[PDB]
Amino acid sequence: VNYGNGVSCSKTKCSVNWGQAFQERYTAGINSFVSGVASGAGSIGRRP
């Protein structure tokens, strides 16, 4: 049973999507920027 979206795996692979990478890569550098910048003065710069 369980007929929904788990029996038919997308694409002919299924192992690791780029999504995971981009987030581990980008957030990794984007996250650090916060902590570091938070130590010096991160109470006035939250405007993308």
Tokens of 42: 């991160």
Q: Where are the domains of the chain?
A: 1-48
Asked if 35 and 43 touch (Cβ cutoff 8 Å), the reply is: no
Backbone angles phi, psi at 47, to 5 degrees: -135, 90
Cα(22)–Cα(14) distance, rounded to whole angstroms?
Answer: 17
CATH topology (fold) of 1-48: 1.20.5
DSSP per residue, the chain: ---SSSSS-STT--S--HHHHHHHHHHHHHHHHHHHHHHHH-SS----
Experimental method: NMR
Cα(19)–Cα(10) distance, rounded to whole angstroms?
Answer: 14
Q: Which of 38, 16, 18, 40 is nearest to 30 (CA)?
A: 38
